[model samples]
Target: SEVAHRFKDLGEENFKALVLIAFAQYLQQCPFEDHVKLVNEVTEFAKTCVADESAENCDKSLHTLFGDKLCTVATLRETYGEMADCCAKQEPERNECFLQHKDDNPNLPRLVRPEVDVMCTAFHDNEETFLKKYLYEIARRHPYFYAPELLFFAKRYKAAFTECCQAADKAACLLPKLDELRDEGKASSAKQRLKCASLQKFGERAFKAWAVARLSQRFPKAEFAEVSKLVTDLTKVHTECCHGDLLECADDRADLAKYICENQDSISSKLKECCEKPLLEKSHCIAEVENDEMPADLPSLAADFVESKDVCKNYAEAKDVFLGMFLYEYARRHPDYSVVLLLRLAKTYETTLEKCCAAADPHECYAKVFDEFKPLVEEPQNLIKQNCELFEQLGEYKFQNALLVRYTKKVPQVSTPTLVEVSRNLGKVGSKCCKHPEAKRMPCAEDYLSVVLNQLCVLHEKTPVSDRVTKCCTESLVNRRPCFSALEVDETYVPKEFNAETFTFHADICTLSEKERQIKKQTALVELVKHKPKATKEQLKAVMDDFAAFVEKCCKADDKETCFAEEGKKLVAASQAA
Candidate 1:
């Protein structure tokens, strides 16, 4: 009966309706009737209540009067209107007056009726103003009152808003603006949520886009040359705003913007005053551009041209010119340099030639440059030959180095002589022997060089060399002595002749007696003579002791079946006799 008692105290008009609303909420059901009853009671109380009544008592009485019978439709309307009026008055008591009533009827209606729908529409109409004041108060003081519940409400509201937008014919017009505001709020929240560094990049990107868009409108029809300079100035401001710790520069965005705006017409002249040259400069201009340090490198440009084969055939030609010019300039400056630089230049020229070979005859275009390049060195013919030889030698060295690196577990240092040097050496050797048509050949010089070259080639191939060549070489040296010893014995030694008269006589004596005196004498004599040359007195004594020990070990008459008993005694006796 607690529910009934609570309902009776609420009264059928207001407090009872509030009790029913609370009960509906407690039961998780619709509180439309209770909501409607509360609204009517509030209306009556506002009209008839005396000024002397305590604000809280009057508010409580108003809710108790009609709270139970009030439908959702009337309650929402009355509550919203009262709250708005309270906010407009800015009277603390009036605000508190409405809150007391709202607090009494805690249940919100779950379902909508026609009147409730009208109330909801009115609430939405003034949502911004209402939410601004109401939510602000709650947010400022009692934010936690409905923190999670408010979020749940907000999700439902967002879903309803989306459905409304999709259903409306004018959806596009309203939705984007709403979305933009929402995004701005989200962006602000995001900044708070993340670290400054995490957001700095995104903020910078957004700022750049904003600044560029704003400045572009201000300087339309202006040459990008001037605009780009201005943009750079703008970038400095952006940098400062985003990165306050950095030192400010004169061309800082804020300062530069003022300078640019003041000299709008002269912006181009100002940029050029900074001596910005166009990319497509002539030779003199290019030299000037180079002096300025802003122009791209000729080699890089040439490379670009080479890469863009399908874009333009002229690019291939231009690539050659760019590379050739760079090479010529480099060579002219560093005249005493090796053929390596020239060879690299030649390679670029060759690549350009290959690229353009099918499209156009590059030979005609590059011949003069080629000729200029050839005479820049001491011996043009020898340099080229040398480079080729160096390449071969490098190949060999690389092979050897690789083997050492892989098999011997060696760390090959880059300090090892370059294959290029080997190639150069090979080329030098070739030139001396007159194998080159360019060189004056001595008689048999060509054949001699050929033989030398072949031998070098064979050595290069046969040698277990690689990047780890040093380690492999060291290992080979360490292992080589045993290999040499094994070979010497296996290949050079003569076989012993079992049919010799001495051997036959020894064998016959060995067969005749278990203790053959003749064989033993012979064996001892042979052993003594073998040692006589190298033996010291002590070593000779040791040898005789070993012989005596062997005789004792082998000449056991009791073990007559043993080879040692049958033959060893005879061998020892024969040696002793000898």
Candidate 2:
């Protein structure tokens, strides 16, 4: 009963107007669905008031009770009646009602009966004129009573009208009038300005609604272009009206009205586009990225790598970590690569490292480490080469992979070798070589020649040999074995020569007997032939040929003993000769 009395005291006009105003306020504070509910409730109430049998009679009774002081009961009743009617109608009639009554009802309570009559006459069709006429009339007549009230009414009316425009499709025509009323309320400056400042705020709200509605309609298609244009125009108007100094056109009222109408949509759209979309998109995008699922195992591996120092302890540990990381990275970059390759590589490295650590002897352990690294190093090189060839086949130029393969493969394993133990073993080999006895031998002339030939061979194999040297050597050594031969040929070739002498002289005894005979017989001369040994040209050529062959063999040895020995001999001979 208390609530009913409270609502009833507000009367049909005041109740409906308050409901409309409160609905707009609710729309501002609440969600669209709640706002719609409130709107529906207010519409129902207004509908009941319009359908009431006592509506006309109550208006006449109210006019008699409260003369022409504030908004008339009849005017208020008619405003609510039209609004309810507009809400109820369908399609064509709905359109007609809004268009016809868009600017109607300008009669306020302050105007004298005659002035009211004159204003009413000026805008015939009482239900088809704008509320501005009545507002202006009220302000002019009793600036004291009507101006403040009119301001309050205009502010609230603008807000309510804008909400309706936004919420209702056919109520679009009310937006311009709503804008006008809001501007008028803002421009008003009476002695009770601060007291009515609340009204100015309401006017602002109404202007915002009207702008929103206008823009929403203008860009009904919601295309970016239309939305953008609407934003630009409305922003310009808002800047000019609210931010900048007010304009002073000759026809100030008309100009103000026109400005409000033209810029409302642009202003609202700009505000919405700037403030709303970024927040909505950011919230949505963040949710999307967060919700995205990564490979479950990968995150764990990454976490382990980050947290466990043991996983990156030594070079092998570091290599294992890197292998996992690289595999993940590869999987991420090249999803089409059967992913099995990554798994295979990772498993191979893991098993290989485990087996290497399980070895018994240090050398065995070192060898195992080398064995593990050999494949790992070689695989990347081979893979890169394959990639290069594949890219070439695809008609794409990628020399970088091939170049990487060449450089990385050539990089001595001893540099970033498998392990410390492997490097230690390599050092042992060097130590053993320096302790050998054959290294102390003093070379003779033939050995020196052999050494020189070996040195020449070393130079020849490593670099280009002169054609003259090659030809001379080839011709001279056509048959003989080289001095540095694997055959261990004899050091001596010549045998000793000896002579024996037997003496007999009977010259004196025979001389007396031969004296008479010797006078007639002189001794005849005798010649003896001896055998001589000589080397043929072919034999010398064969020796030279053997020498050259020996030189070549020495150059090709992996340890290069022939070359080293030859070089040593040459140094000794050169020193001696000097």
Candidate 3:
């Protein structure tokens, strides 16, 4: 086949590497069943594109045969194109070249799985299709899950269906089983994501270094060995916590949290606010706030980037530890730059050394790395500018509802109460920030929104919402905001259920001032809309009309309290006309 000959330049080993690398990339970004079909298509084509032909002829034939079938999807075509670049490289570097572009594909949009009722409908329709769909939904959200984990879930889902479909109430039986599966997937995947994120932000060596240095600075009078033991315990918590060993991690963190709080005077005064929080909230509060001061004596490390002669050797000794030190030093001096920004700078510096240390003249490479630092800073600033502008244009009410709808659809599995609370906090961001003078509003909103987003990220830790929620929560606290701001609503999503209580129609209403009555009516209207966001405009107006008429009659009744209690039940029943 011309295909085989096409890059006879890529030897047999390189060709096999290309297939695996490209398949793995597609696996991460494509639907599981769709990717399986794609793999089958490629395998079928490969069988015909036989080997042993001359390089030129095989390459030519292979391209003609594979191009039509294999290049159909944009991602498939892009992968092949990228991998082909590695074919041109020397064999020694070809494998690295193939791996380099592996993460180039954009993330697929988040998807919402069908509700329990819908799943039951599908299961009754066809067992095979339903099971496959279940596995696809599982794998779709958790590309990080291993093969055995997915297989276990598939088997579990099948067992649930086998028992539940014959039950008197299939939805009731299936709902709990399904919730169990979803929560398990979210829990397992959350740990996997957190582990990966921690490695990326603070590799083992770097994290250890940072941990020890952090405690040492916070407790200046503590013995060095004591500080080392504390850091060892903390790192153990992170290792276990990020690896799904939750109960012990919880115990360790609880003890550590109490110790830090009790010694707040010796640790740092800045933790006063965080320490004042109740035990459970205290740890999260401390994590969310950026301390303004590090011990004043820690030396600045910025000049090392431009002035050092042996950084590459130091980096080579233990890359993470060196980067960790860089992060600690840089962060203390530049308090305004967030953890995300500081981590990013460390990463860029790492890459700079990787390239420069291997260069013909390392000195030249090292000297120019920081010459153009403007682009790095401008990237975040540009994003901040755009979001702030949009927020101002939308105003508080529009922004509030938009934010509510956006997040509600993104993680519909989250209870309405949680969404309402977060949404309310988001609205306050607009109210407080947009009130600032025009010159200062963007900065003001940036800081205000960052705090709000940090709290949002903590939801997965505190409540463990879903795998979709875990996706952003795994990010560095400041970085989670961008991760969330880019999300799109799941347009096809429908709430699994919604139930709001009827308004309290006590005859205390009859004694109320006009202002109070108006406020009560408005509360009823907003509560109705909040609970029934999908209700038709006409339906909402009708419910409001019914409430208005009920108030008119009950307010004038001889026994106002009895009238309201009786009429309120009737009014609620009438509105159930849905």
Candidate 4:
């Protein structure tokens, strides 16, 4: 009975569970021949692990396991070797280093998932084995998912399986559930990756400050102490979770929900539903809960709006925190601007301060920075947000085509090659980020699509000049996209006379990268579309199909030049027929 109280704490209660999860993650990544031996070693180590365990003992245990057994395998050796370096430091730092260690490479090829029929059969045979396989599959697919998020899905998955497995017809009941789970996981992981991107873009200090500012705004009436503590838990979840600290992330997130739930009255009355959610969902729910209006007693959003003279002094004290505060104020004041746009403004402001503080007339220089923030600031912001809304309405397939058509129409005089490149890049951003949940789409669009426009400006700068291109490119690099967004379609422009020779492809095209090769093919299609101008999408697609077949054959031929010369003429003829 005396020993029972020790397990009351979330940390102590979950020690074995935590270790087992870690072991599972590791074991799945690198399977050893002697499973019982590996499990026995981990069990003995877990038994001896104390709350106040010395860093030396921790390192020794890790060395015994990783150095002796796990690292023996070639697959695990390099990864563990990199991780073991963290042990050289002291306890908390050592732990922090371990958490920060980069392991999973998300861009690696995806793992092949088991067939549903096979999965159901396996589950019928052995639930434990089936669960293990399912867990491993998800971990590999969503390599960036935080441990807590992964576990949430994992729990739901098991629940679904349990409910479906008992059904008279297992496949029918489980089929829809499996589909729902797959879609849900894909979207959730996309949202999570966006947060991780924020963390990477802005360092921990700045990111945490943003989190604090956001939470504070949400719970405007909450005391500073309460807000601060909650943000600590919130930030800790991302800081550890994003960097692969599975147990700590799960524990901190568990505490995060509890803190908000317990202090609901003081923190946020609006979190009733959020607080009632499951552990992982609770944190996310709390995150999405609406912000209370700024309390009258509290300082205004501009309370700390510094004059130019104090800018350097204030910034010198804490650059990241100051930038974060600036972000908080800018974002709160102009809720219209997406986080992607807001981040750009923050960076611009930082650059303004950096230059101003060094100048003889710091006040004058920094003060005038506001001049750049007038109409142009909100223009691109609006365009990006509107396009995201459009993306949701039009879906990726239509959105991609819409962008291509829109770009070609807006700057009709630009070379077919440049327009194809611009639209394809922009379309990719929509496809990549717009597939996220609707509420979170704007920021992803602003952040990712903004870069596409900037790159477009550079492309246009290098291409044959056109009216719209000149107007946009004349502005500052950051402002060009807004210029493009605001421009009218070139109604007066006419397509040049169609030339069959324009469709020519050289054998040298095969030497380019796969992506570059794609661009060439895309360019050919666009050129044909421009020639016809009135061709149906179906007709255009037929021409595109011809190009695809041509490339597929000619790119692998013994003499690419002869194959291209012969096949290329057919593309020209195909365009005419269409």
Q: Judged by TM-score relative to the true structure, which candidate is superior, 1 or 3?
A: 3
lDDT of 1 by residue, 302-368 (tens): 3332333342445354653444333334433332333233433445455545654655544444433
After superposition, which runs of candidate 4 have C-alpha atoms over 4 Å from their true positions? 1-41, 48-69, 75-118, 194-202, 220-229, 278-281, 293-303, 306-322, 332-336, 351-371, 385-395, 401-444, 447-542, 545-578
- Model 3's C-alpha root-mean-square deviation from the true structure amounts to 18.1
**Candidate 2 backbone clash number:** 24
lDDT of 3 by residue, 1-578 (tens): 43444224333432332332234442345445554465456554444555454433344422233323333443344554554555555433543443344331134664555666666677778876566555555544443333223444666788898788778887789889987987666545543444334444546554565455445434444444555566777777676444322223445665777787787766556787888876445665664454445565654464666577887888889876566556555554554444444555666788888898888777777677654455765565666556556677877644655556556656666655556656756666666655656455544555455545544554445557566567776644445666776766444445433343446467677776664564466445555554544533446557776786688887777773776667677777666565
| Segments in model 2 whose C-alpha atoms lie over 4 Å from true places | 26-33, 39-180, 188-193, 196-578
Report the lDDT of model 3 for residue 487: 69
lDDT tens digits by residue: candidate 4, 154-202: 6678788788867787778887998798877765655565456456544
TM-score of 4: 0.61
- lDDT (tens digit, per residue) of candidate 2 on 211-267: 333333322323334433443444343332221111111112223334433553432
Q: Which whole-number lDDT from 0 to 100 does residue 366 have in model 2? A: 32
lDDT-superior candidate, 2 or 4: 4
Candidate 2 vs candidate 4, TM-score winner: 4
Candidates in descending TM-score order: 4, 3, 1, 2
Clashing pairs in 4: none
TM-score of model 2 (CA atoms): 0.14
- Lowest summed lDDT across 10 adjacent residues in model 3 is found at 61-70
- Please give the ranking of all candidate structures by lDDT, highest first, separated by commas: 4, 3, 1, 2
TM-score of 3: 0.39
Best by lDDT: 4
